[PDB]
């Protein structure tokens, strides 16, 4: 968690140097942190982060699958 947050902070900090590259780096780091929150059983934060990613990057399939997996874990199979 500490390292993922530092990576997000660093990508944000040095985004002006290259916004395009650092945006993609932050997208992957953000997905990692959401997966971690899932690991730490913070499924609300993980779900919010997955939805935040999907809102801006609707082509990130893994976020859809993680939301579905969390829903399945909840027991909501539909």
């Amino acid at each position: 968690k500490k390292y993922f947050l530092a990576s997000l902070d660093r990508a944000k900090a040095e985004a002006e140097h290259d916004e395009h590259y650092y945006n993609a780096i932050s997208v992957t780091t953000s997905y990692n942190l959401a997966r971690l929150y899932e690991a730490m059983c913070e499924f609300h934060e993980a779900e919010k982060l997955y939805k935040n990613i999907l809102r801006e990057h609707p082509n990130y399939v893994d976020c859809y699958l993680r939301l579905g997996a969390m829903a399945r874990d909840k027991g909501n199979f539909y």
Partner: peptide, 24 residues
Amino acid sequence: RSGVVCRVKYCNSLPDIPFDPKFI
């Protein structure tokens, strides 16, 4: 011919799809 009611099943259940953190 009496015993604990339990049907023994030899199961081969695949693991869930891995979703490990991605490396950049």
